[PDB]
């Protein structure tokens, strides 16, 4: 699903364009420049700006609607009322003067980083070498446009999501409509470059304005494990578990050491089985394949035990009404209970079979739980597009990556 990145955020241009429009409908947006004494000047008054496709890398490409204005070179007069230039511009992150741990995504015309694609439509004269030279005297008014495309929060209450390195990229598809987006690596200072910038269009959907894609690893470590590792009795606590790397984004859950199961009462006695090696890897996109093995000693016959082997597939489950993530039992392709005894003593062998079969059930049963995260909290945790929270989460998908989707209000 993802592309070698750790957490990817994304937003509809259809969304930001609109918050852009009434940031402009605030109306204090006139641009003046006069080159002296080169006899040049423009006064541009803006109707609307509109982000469009064609944006490559850091850059946005945007349609500029002028509805009042002028422009003079060498005693030549041209009123810019209605001309519609098309620019490409750079965005970069700007640290904040309030909370510096909140980095802020704004326009940036430093020093160079504005290109003119089309000059105007279509009320112009070909002789527009001067308009372009001059409207790149945009820069003088860089500070005037302080629009916040997204707030990005390092040092949030959710620590595993905190980004160390991260950068902006615009996704334009093959069909026309699009969403731009922001890519990160959390905590880890990995190679970073060269990583791709290609993004999964899956992140957004027809129903959803904002999307968030969590890598498989982060999901395993910070979403599944925390629940699982506390679903198995008081002598198991995730400190008992490792998550092992297979890629820098692909990961398997193995046990760090012996897992001490809680006590099961069979007939008159309590038994305390122990799983010795444990494995949970992600399988067929949305299912978990669990593969454990261990034993259970017979209390009172210490040196007579039952060897326990299970394979058990569980499945992701999403409840769109209460926004709950769930895993249920899909199959139990292996539940093998094989008592170890010799000759005559069939009588313990039989309780060994029975404690074995009870223990296996206990195991499986623990693989069927419901996570407790607040996913609304999660999507809103690091990136808030346009300095805004998301009201409703529209879908959650586990297809190798872990994807949360929603609408802002």
Query: Structure tokens of 360?
Result: 């296996």
Q: Of 330, 331, 348, 327, which is closest to residue 339 (Cα–Cα)?
A: 348
| Cβ 1 vs Cβ 399: under 8 Å | yes
List the resolution, Å.
Answer: 2.8
Q: What is d(CA 259, CA 379) in angstroms, rounded to the nearest whole number?
A: 33
Closest CA to 401 of 184, 216, 182: 216
Half-sphere exposure of 74 (CA within 13 A, CB side): 2
Which SS3 state, helix, strand or coil, does residue 338 take? strand
- The structure's method of determination equals X-ray
Task: Say if CB 369 and CB 228 are below 8 A apart.
Answer: yes
| Of the candidates 229, 224, 248, 233, the residue with the CA atom closest to the CA atom of residue 325 | 224
Helix (H), strand (E) at residue 101: none
Question: Would you say the C-alpha torsion 347, 349, 351, 353 has a positive or negative sign?
Answer: negative
Other beta carbons within 10 angstroms of residue 258's beta carbon come to 15
State how far the Cα of 2 lies from the Cα of 248, in Å rounded to an integer: 12
Helix and strand counts by DSSP (H, E) for the chain: 6, 25
Contacts of 302 (CB under 8 A, 6+ apart): none
Answer whether 277's CB lies under 8 Å from 308's CB.
no
Provide CB contacts within 8 A for 10, sequence distance 6+: 171, 179, 180, 181, 182, 199, 203, 204, 210, 211, 212, 213
Nearest to 212 by CA among 26, 373, 81, 39: 373
Peptide bond into 122 cis (omega under 30): yes
CB atoms within 10 A of CB 165: 16
Residues 293 and 125: their CA atoms lie apart, in Å, by 79
CA Rg value for the chain:
30
Task: State the CB neighbour count (10 A cutoff) for residue 338.
Answer: 11
């Amino acid at each position: 699903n993802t592309y070698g990145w750790d957490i990817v955020y994304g937003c509809s241009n259809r969304v930001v364009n609109k918050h852009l429009k009434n940031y402009i409908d605030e109306n204090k947006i006139e641009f003046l420049y006069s080159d002296i004494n080169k006899k040049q000047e423009i006064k541009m008054i803006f109707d609307n700006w509109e982000i469009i496709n064609g944006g490559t890398s850091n850059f946005l490409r945007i349609k500029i609607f002028i509805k009042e204005g002028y422009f003079k070179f060498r005693n030549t007069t041209v009123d810019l009322s209605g001309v519609i230039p098309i620019l490409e511009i750079k965005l970069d992150f700007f640290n904040d003067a309030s909370n510096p741990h909140i980095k802020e995504l704004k326009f940036s015309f430093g020093n160079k980083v504005i290109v003119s694609d089309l000059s105007g439509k279509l009320y112009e004269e070909d002789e527009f070498y001067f308009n372009k030279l001059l409207i790149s005297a945009f820069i003088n008014n860089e500070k005037q446009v302080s629009y916040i495309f997204a707030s990005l929060n390092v040092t949030s209450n959710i620590v595993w999501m905190n980004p160390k390195q991260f950068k902006f990229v615009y996704y334009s598809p093959t069909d026309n409509n699009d969403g731009y987006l922001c890519i990160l690596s959390v905590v880890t200072n990995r190679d970073i470059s060269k990583l791709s910038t290609n993004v999964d269009s899956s992140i957004l959907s027809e129903n959803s304005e904002v999307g968030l894609l969590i890598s498989e690893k982060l999901f395993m470590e910070n979403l599944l494990l925390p629940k699982l590792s506390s679903n198995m009795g008081s002598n198991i606590t995730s400190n008992n578990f490792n998550v092992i790397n297979t890629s820098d984004t692909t990961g398997i859950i193995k046990n760090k050491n012996t897992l001490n199961w809680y006590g099961i009462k069979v007939a008159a006695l309590y038994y305390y089985p122990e799983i010795n090696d444990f494995s949970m890897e992600l399988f067929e996109g949305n299912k978990l394949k669990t593969r454990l093995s261990g034993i259970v000693k017979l209390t009172g016959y210490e040196r007579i035990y039952s060897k326990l082997n299970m394979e058990c597939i569980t499945k992701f489950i999403y409840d769109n009404k209460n926004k709950k993530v769930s895993f249920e039992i899909y199959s139990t392709p292996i539940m093998e209970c094989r008592p170890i005894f010799g000759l005559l003593d069939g009588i313990p062998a039989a309780v060994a079979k029975s404690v074995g079969n009870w223990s296996l059930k206990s195991f499986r049963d623990s693989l069927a739980f419901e996570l407790a995260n607040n996913f609304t909290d999660i999507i809103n945790d690091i990136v808030n597009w346009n300095n805004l929270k998301i009201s409703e989460v529209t879908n959650i998908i586990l297809n190798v990556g872990f994807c949360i989707q929603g609408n802002m209000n």
